[PDB]
Amino acid sequence: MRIVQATLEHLDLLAPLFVKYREFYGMLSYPESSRKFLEKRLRRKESVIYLALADEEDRLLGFCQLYPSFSSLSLKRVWILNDIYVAEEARRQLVADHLLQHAKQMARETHAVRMRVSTSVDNEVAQKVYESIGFREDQEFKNYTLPISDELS
Amino acid sequence: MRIVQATLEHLDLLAPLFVKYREFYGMLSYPESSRKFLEKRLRRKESVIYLALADRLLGFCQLYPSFSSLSLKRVWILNDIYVAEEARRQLVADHLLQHAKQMARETHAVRMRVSTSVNEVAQKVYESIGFREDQEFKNYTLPISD
Known part of the structure; x- marks a missing residue:
């Protein structure tokens, strides 16, 4: 119902939900490294994190992150x-939307040429949501990857 | 023969080769803006530009x-990666990308990514050092502006 930009203040409110997200997609929970990761980002202002909060209280229904x-x-x-993610209790679509829209309107507001998203080939649902908000998989380019570190730890 | 991270002291030397790189890809060379763009990226540390010095700028590469x-x-x-016309085509490139790859290791990145037209020469250069066709992820774009 209400969107707000995450700052260092929300770290404790967002940390637990950030874990759920990573866990939901196949990662080990690493509660501390996850809270530590978000701190560097919030603290260094290296990303924009949008938070969907219920009108009444400050309960995180979902969140979004752009780099x-x-x-x-x-x-x-x-x-x-x-990242884009809604909590179980919250209705995925209704909340995922407000976030993505607010996010897209921001890109526009800042004269961005484009928005780029990358996600697991094994995330049919995730990919569907992206496609439904504009995103396309332009096949006129070859994408490369060079594994440097580990994905698990 | 020498790779170094670009600094604000290199702006004058890098700006023109940067413009030739954009012109090469069919862009309107914006002499100032391109220079203006590099200065801010450099001052705000919003990217990492590695210079290949011989010391005249032989080529450069930039990662976001x-x-x-x-x-x-x-x-x-x-x-971006661009080796000036008057230089071998793949030597300065290897030294640049290798040095980049090494930074990735020293900074514990999970991976490095690169794209290119579906441009055979590039692919041979990238594959030349680890880059493989991304089979782990699916990539999307969404036009936003002019």
Whole structure:
């Protein structure tokens, strides 16, 4: 019902929900590393995290995270959309939407050339939601990956 | 023969080669804006530009910062790499990308990413050092502006 930008203040409110998200997608919960990760991001202002809060109290219904980027070619901003997530109790779609919309309106407001998202080939649902809000899988480019570290720890 | 992270002291030297890189990809060379763009990226540490010095600028490469929430780690996105016309085509590139790859290791990134037109020469250069066709993820774009 209400969207707000996460700041260091919300860390404790968002930390537990951030875990649920990672767990829901196949990761080990690492409660502390997860809270530590979010701190660096909130504290260093390296990402924009939107929080969907119920009108009454400050209970996190869902959250969204984007990473700021750029296009050297068109000398304009780009927004990487890494995370989007709603809690069980909350209705996925209703909340996922307000977040994504607020997020997209922000990209527009900041004259971004585009928004780019990347997700597991095994996330049919996740991918469906993305497609329903614009995103396309432009097949006119080849995507590469070079594993450097571990994904598990 | 020498790779170094670009600093604000290199702006004058890097700006023009950066413009030639954009022009190469069919863009309107914005001499100032491109220079303006680099200065801010450099001053705000919103990217990492590695210079290949011989000392005249032989080529450069730039990566933008990203993260993997899932594995709680950094992800480096190799966005630009350009070797000046008057230089071998794959030597300065290897030294640049290798040095980049090494930074990825020293900063514990989960992975490095790179894209390109479906541009055979590039692919041979990237595959030349680890980059494999991403079979773990599915990638999307969504046009936003002009």
